[PDB]
Point group: C3
Chain length 114, copies 3
């Protein structure tokens, strides 16, 4: 899976080890080995949420499987939780888009996962 | 809804008030309350369009509903017009990707919109 | 088509001419005239892949048509090869997400392609 966080929080406010923590927690939450987890954190962004430039985040989680109604509620609780604790972003200023990819539409290592 | 603009126009050429103007215009166009609209503008990017690095933009608009053939034409007229007037990007050097998201695939405030 | 490369390789490691080379190679690979191809390269990113911060890339290719099982395998070989040769990223540290877009969901020049 792939997890992307775009935020207007400054780079200095992102803890060291945040990328490793995300990797570990996503591995547990999705049941995927950590070897397959990619995480991308984009701070210092020009963003507004509801008209306001208070801290906010726009996120995406792409996976082959492990996406659905109930799992996505679980992931939202986990990820809003981590962003609130570590980046000090309110969970009502977070959107997370979930994408269930087909394996033929994910390239890796000169081929696809199909 | 969420609206993301990626452009090679420098940060200095992005006018004051632009993120608020986009929030207001998108609220008018989509009917959604401004409180739920998120905007993200990414200047200074390394981009080319048709082989040339003249000003250009790559955009996306995600919404739960209010996406479809006729609506998307209207959004394109609106957004290309704003980009041309405020950032001086020609409309024929803009692509906008539209995504109709299922409510169960959008996380917000520790849950999803399902 | 649109091709986006996010990577933790530094800006100075991106060779001169790379955006044009991507444009040319995607035109040949997809069969689309180069006037339609847009490319966006984002270096210097905070990223991890498999828990490691070694060079990696997260990419996406969006097209109207020309997306599918066998075509995506060919694209992956071409694009992993380019990233390996030009940015010295190992192909097993690259993910490429492929998106087949409907013409009604792509805006351009004040309308859509529908
Ligand atoms: O657009 C909406 O219905 C909404 O209120 C929020 C929203 C947020 C993110 C997204 O990708 C789609 C919709
Ligand atoms: O999670 C997996 O199974 C993967 O094969 C890895 C993967 C899934 C979805 C992506 O967009 C990127 C990588
Ligand atoms: O690929 C084509 O046919 C285009 O006309 C250009 C295009 C296709 C898909 C996109 O998401 C953006 C641009």
């Amino acid at each position: 899976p792939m997890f992307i966080v775009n935020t207007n929080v400054p780079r200095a406010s992102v803890p060291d080890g945040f990328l490793s923590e995300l990797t570990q927690q996503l591995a547990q939450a999705t049941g995927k080995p950590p070897q397959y987890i990619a995480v991308h954190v984009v701070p210092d962004q020009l963003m507004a949420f509801g008209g306001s430039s208070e801290p906010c985040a726009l996120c995406s989680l792409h996976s082959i499987g492990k996406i659905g109604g109930a799992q996505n509620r679980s992931y939202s609780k986990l990820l809003c939780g981590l962003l609130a604790e570590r980046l000090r972003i309110s969970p009502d200023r977070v959107y997370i888009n979930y994408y269930d990819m087909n394996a033929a539409n994910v390239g890796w290592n000169n081929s696809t996962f199909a």
